[PDB]
Amino acid sequence: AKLQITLTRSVIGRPETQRKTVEALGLKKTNSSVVVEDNPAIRGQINKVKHLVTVEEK
Amino acid sequence: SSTKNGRDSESKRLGAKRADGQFVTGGSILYRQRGTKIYPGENVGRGGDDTLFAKIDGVVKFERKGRDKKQVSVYAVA
Amino acid sequence: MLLPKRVKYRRQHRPKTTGRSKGGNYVTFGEFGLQATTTSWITSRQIESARIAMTRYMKRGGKVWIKIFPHTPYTKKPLEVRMGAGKGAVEGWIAVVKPGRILFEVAGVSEEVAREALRLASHKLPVKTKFVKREEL
Amino acid sequence: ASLKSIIRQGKQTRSDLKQLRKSGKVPAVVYGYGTKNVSVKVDEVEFIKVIREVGRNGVIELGVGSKTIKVMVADYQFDPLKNQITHIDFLAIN
Amino acid sequence: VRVNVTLACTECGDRNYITTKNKRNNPERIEMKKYCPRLNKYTLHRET
RNA sequence: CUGGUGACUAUAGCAAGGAGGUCACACCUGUUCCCAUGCCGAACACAGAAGUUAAGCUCCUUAGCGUCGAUGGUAGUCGAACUUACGUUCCGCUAGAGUAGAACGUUGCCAGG
RNA sequence: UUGGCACCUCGAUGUCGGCUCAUCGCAUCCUGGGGCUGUAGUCGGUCCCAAGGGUUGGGCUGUUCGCCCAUUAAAGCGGUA
RNA sequence: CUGGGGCGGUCGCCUCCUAAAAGGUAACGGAGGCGCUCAAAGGUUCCCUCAGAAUGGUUCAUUCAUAGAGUGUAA
RNA sequence: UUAUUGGAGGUAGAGCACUGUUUGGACGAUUCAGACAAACUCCGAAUGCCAAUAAUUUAACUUGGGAGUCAGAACAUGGGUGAUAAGGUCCGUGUUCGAAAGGGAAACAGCCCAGACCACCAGCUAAGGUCCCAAAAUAUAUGUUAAGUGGAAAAGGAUGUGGCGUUGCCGUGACACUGCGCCGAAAAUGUACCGGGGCUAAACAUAUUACCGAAGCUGUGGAUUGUCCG
Ligand SMILES: [Mg+2]
Ligand SMILES: [Mg+2]
Ligand SMILES: [Mg+2]
Ligand SMILES: [Mg+2]
Ligand SMILES: [Mg+2]
Ligand SMILES: [Mg+2]
Ligand SMILES: [Mg+2]
Ligand SMILES: [Mg+2]
Ligand SMILES: [Mg+2]
Ligand SMILES: [Mg+2]
Ligand SMILES: [Mg+2]
Ligand SMILES: [Mg+2]
Ligand SMILES: [Mg+2]
Ligand SMILES: [Mg+2]
Ligand SMILES: [Mg+2]
Ligand SMILES: [Mg+2]
Ligand SMILES: [Mg+2]
Ligand SMILES: [Mg+2]
Ligand SMILES: [Mg+2]
Ligand SMILES: [Mg+2]
Ligand SMILES: [Mg+2]
Ligand SMILES: [Mg+2]
Ligand SMILES: [Mg+2]
Ligand SMILES: [Mg+2]
Ligand SMILES: [Mg+2]
Ligand SMILES: [Mg+2]
Ligand SMILES: [Mg+2]
Ligand SMILES: [Mg+2]
Ligand SMILES: [Mg+2]
Ligand SMILES: [Mg+2]
Ligand SMILES: [Mg+2]
Ligand SMILES: [Mg+2]
Ligand SMILES: [Mg+2]
Ligand SMILES: [Mg+2]
Ligand SMILES: [Mg+2]
Ligand SMILES: [Mg+2]
Ligand SMILES: [Mg+2]
Ligand SMILES: [Mg+2]
Ligand SMILES: [Mg+2]
Ligand SMILES: [Mg+2]
Ligand SMILES: [Zn+2]
């Protein structure tokens, strides 16, 4: 019931809305990580920026 | 030669001014329009230029009327 | 054919040429047809030349249907003028053809004759074409 | 008169349908009196053989999941380019 | 319409009520009852 | 069951056939009064009750037109990858048209019976 | 080529023609090789290979261009501000 | 203002399209209109319903006719 | 910012119910069939937008002091204009440059990867790559190409070759779809678009396993400024 989200791609060259979603997930710099409880809202954020992040069931 | 065209009037910023489900005060404009594209509903007035406005404080509801017509009402928040 | 007898607006935005053919993708009046596999504008002169070729080869006797009509006018500026100062004057009339659109239909001749006539017509057109028969299961 | 169909399990994606049509199969749906709606897939060559052996308004014995229900070709979708049947509507005539 | 007019009361010295008319249509001095603030009633205001 | 009066996106409407008037509704007979026609008691209004279901109106059986309408697929397209190809690929959303099918109304009060 | 665009140059990138001197391309004017011919021969037409060399002296006009006179195997077309 | 400048055209306001289904959005882009009018063509109450077609008659009548008429004026 | 819920609106597509355009029948304008539309719509998305109450996140607004800016550019994409010309021009949307170094694209503001506090002769990766120039596979499996195609182009032409099929006569044909090649293919200082050498794979298509590769991330030490509790 917890996911670890890692920012594996740069936000450079990405539209502002994707950058805002990445910021809302708590990810700061490239290869930084967060651990958050799984719920539909977090899943929606991840789906929006899934080409930029890696998800591990943690 | 020359073009005979090149004229236009100022855009009039019509359309919805408040959202369905939003709370508004009395006198708030809900909709600017030409004609009755949307009709005045409950506790909603229709101004001289067809502007729809709330007559009470309350919550805006856009609803259908008949088959091919629409209306907007305002209902007092309980 | 040649052109509309009248149109509301003689200066029109040019049509979009991407995508596939919206309709008229089946043989519906005759036995055989010319189906476009490539996209292009088709002018009234191209239509008229293709029609003359096909009907001359068929030696009359058969029937010819032209399924596309040049509804859209297009404009051209005068030779050697700077940009701007309004849109040009109507230069010709075109139809938009996308893959799948049947251009001509024929009936009343044998299969071999239809094939030869449609090949001759297709060599006048700016699109790749394929010979098609009336579609059944 | 006889054609065998495989039930299409779940919701197919676009890629699933593309692979299906590439592999010579035709997505199809069965509906009508006496049958509940089910998505199936039949071989294109076999379907053409059956259709040429019975015609257009004919009755087809369609094996649909341990049930030999009788159907008629209500409608079908065809791609004039590449000359390929893309979808079939089997109506169970009861 | 055609020309601006001023309607005058018989008691008020104000000419508050201006309006318009068509001279060919109404060449005669038009008159109508209008509210008069200084008398607090409707009186007869006539074209000047 | 009928009527009065509301609510609902015609699933309610039109069309064709048949059944009924005990009360009720209606057609109807008239113009003295109230009222009334750019003319006419056709309408509106008023007296009524000779009569009649004939039409309106109720009831019944039809999907004929109209309306409603899936599933499946197709077009389009948010996003991603490739690419410059009148493009390809993956993913989510997903029409319009057409198909099966629904449907010859459901219901709130008030009164009568 | 006539243009379209306005990207370098306006604290300056001299414009046409000729003269002098060339250099490169080949879509070849001549010369060399060859296929077809409605190629008898002599001459031609057309296409293919080929850039080695060659490819004019005057009248008119500032002219380029062009017309003309007289030749020549031929008097080629273009690029190089 | 200006796909250099001049010459031509334009300069304020209204409507539509371009305009990418909120709003906004440019070009010497595509189309038009305004610089009024009406003493009722304003207010209110009551009543009313069109264009067209067919069919008959030396304008009238019947039937259909959701408006295909009208709405002072451009959309 | 996302989830969910509600709403406004007419684009893409589609359609022909209205307006206009158009093809072939039939009957004597209507009807059957089939098409077209920025200023057509019986319809109608995806998205975007406005809101309402959960998750994550870090802003937001007001009032004052001080500005600078009002020449923009390319790329991608929705469109006008032009010629479905321009490194053209004018709007919408996004990114980068501007004001951004580092790696890749031979060189190359605007493309791809990625945002340099300082030091290191440490490590892992991105785009892109791994025969030599020049770091890392002369890697593995299956096949295609014979054109140096790869390493700039079309209508059209052709017993080039491979995979798929529906078929006909009795080895042989017809037809349909498709992979990769061939011809069509002529320019000016010098080979002269693979960057060069070279390559029949060191080309191309699928699949897999390694490795190289940046100032990205990590490791160690240090500087400055903040936050939490030196
Ligand atoms: Mg406007
Ligand atoms: Mg007013
Ligand atoms: Mg159609
Ligand atoms: Mg030039
Ligand atoms: Mg510029
Ligand atoms: Mg200068
Ligand atoms: Mg200098
Ligand atoms: Mg040569
Ligand atoms: Mg030579
Ligand atoms: Mg020479
Ligand atoms: Mg100028
Ligand atoms: Mg002038
Ligand atoms: Mg929008
Ligand atoms: Mg808008
Ligand atoms: Mg004007
Ligand atoms: Mg004026
Ligand atoms: Mg469209
Ligand atoms: Mg038509
Ligand atoms: Mg047409
Ligand atoms: Mg439209
Ligand atoms: Mg461009
Ligand atoms: Mg530019
Ligand atoms: Mg832009
Ligand atoms: Mg920046
Ligand atoms: Mg850089
Ligand atoms: Mg760099
Ligand atoms: Mg570089
Ligand atoms: Mg290069
Ligand atoms: Mg470099
Ligand atoms: Mg380069
Ligand atoms: Mg490594
Ligand atoms: Mg190297
Ligand atoms: Mg090495
Ligand atoms: Mg090569
Ligand atoms: Mg090459
Ligand atoms: Mg070639
Ligand atoms: Mg080289
Ligand atoms: Mg290289
Ligand atoms: Mg490093
Ligand atoms: Mg760092
Ligand atoms: Zn007074």
How would DSSP label each residue in E1-48?
A: --EEEEEE-SS-----EEEEE-TTT--S--EEEEEETTTTEEEEEEE-
Place of tokens 């009037």: B9
SS3 call for D61: strand
Number of H helices, E strands in chain C: 2, 7
Q: In this structure, which amino acid lies at residue D1?
A: A
CB A56 within 8 A of CB A10: no
Tokens describing residue C93? 């009339």
Q: In this structure, which amino acid lies at residue C44?
A: S
SS3 call for C87: coil
The distance of B14 to chain C (nearest Cα, Å) reads 27
CATH number of C24-137: 3.90.1170.10
Domain limits of chain C? 24-137
E6 vs C22: CA distance, rounded Å: 68
The distance of C132 to chain D (nearest Cα, Å) reads 9
Q: In this structure, which amino acid lies at residue D60?
A: I
Domain that holds residue D68: 2-93
B near C: at least 3 beta-carbon pairs less than 8 Å apart: yes
CB C33 within 8 A of CB C115: no
Tokens describing residue C124? 């006048």
D near E: at least 3 beta-carbon pairs less than 8 Å apart: no
Tokens describing residue A43? 């899943």
Domain containing residue D52: CATH number: 2.40.240.10
Domain that holds residue A40: 1-57
Dmax (CA) of chain E = 34
B near D: at least 3 beta-carbon pairs less than 8 Å apart: no
Neighbour order of strands in the sheet with B15-16: B15-16, B29-32, B52-54, B44-46
Way it was determined: cryo-EM
Phi, psi of C9 (to 5 degrees): -125, 120
Neighbour order of strands in the sheet with C102-107: C63-66, C102-107, C32-36, C129-133
Query: Which regions of B1-78 does DSSP assign to beta strands (E)?
Result: 15-16, 23-24, 29-32, 39-40, 44-46, 52-54, 58-65, 69-75
Residue of chain C whose alpha carbon sits nearest to that of B6? C86
Domain containing residue A20: CATH number: 3.30.1390.20
From first CA to last CA, the distance across chain E in angstroms is 17
B50 vs B31: CA distance, rounded Å: 9
A53 vs A6: CA distance, rounded Å: 5
Q: In this structure, which amino acid lies at residue C106?
A: V
Nearest partner of C43 among C91, C94, C96, judged by Cα: C94
Task: Please report all neighbours of D, defined by 3+ CB atom pairs within 8 A.
Answer: C
Q: Which of D45, D77, D81 to mutate to test the interface with C (most CBs of C within 10 A)?
A: D81
Task: Please report all neighbours of C, defined by 3+ CB atom pairs within 8 A.
Answer: B, D
Tokens describing residue C1? 């054919």
CA distances E1 to C41, C98, E8, E26, Å, are 56, 60, 20, 11
Nearest nt to the C11 alpha carbon by C1'? H30
A53 vs D65: CA distance, rounded Å: 43
**CA triplet D57, D63, D65: central angle to 5 degrees?**
140
Distance from the alpha carbon of residue A9 to the mean position of ligand 25, in angstroms: 18
Nearest partner of B35 among B14, B4, B62, judged by Cα: B14
Place of tokens 């209902």: B75
Å from A12 (CA) to I72 (C1')? 22
Q: Is the CB of C80 under 7 A from strand G?
A: yes
**How many domains does one find in chain A?**
1
Question: Containing H/E element for D32?
Answer: strand D25-32
Contacts of A19 (CB under 8 A, 6+ apart): A11
Q: What is the 8-class DSSP label of residue C86?
A: S
> Which ligand is located closest to the Cα atom of residue C67?
19
Contacts of A48 (CB under 8 A, 6+ apart): A18, A21
**How many domains does one find in chain D?**
1
C31 vs C114: CA distance, rounded Å: 9
Chain I positions under 7 Å from a protein CB? 1-9, 13-16, 20-25, 33-40, 43, 48, 50-52, 54-58, 79-86, 88-89, 94-96, 112-115, 155-156, 165-167, 176-178, 216-218
Contacts of B3 in chain C (CB under 8 A): 85-87
Q: What is the 8-class DSSP label of residue C134?
A: P
How many of the other CB atoms lie within 10 Å of CB of D46? 16
CB D39 within 8 A of CB D47: no
Tokens describing residue D58? 């004919």
Radius of gyration of chain A (CA): 10
CB B72 within 8 A of CB B44: yes
CB C60 within 8 A of CB C113: no
Radius of gyration of chain E (CA): 11
The distance of B7 to chain C (nearest Cα, Å) reads 13
Dmax (CA) of chain C = 57
Burial (CB count <10 Å: 0-12, 13-18, 19+), residue E4: exposed
Q: Is the CB of A15 under 7 A from strand I?
A: yes
Tokens describing residue E8? 């005058």
A49 vs A26: CA distance, rounded Å: 13
Chain G positions under 7 Å from a protein CB? 2-5
Task: Please report all neighbours of E, defined by 3+ CB atom pairs within 8 A.
Answer: none
Place of tokens 């002018």: C43
Tokens describing residue B21? 């489900």
CA distances E21 to D4, D13, E15, Å, are 89, 75, 16
Å from C69 (CA) to I165 (C1')? 38
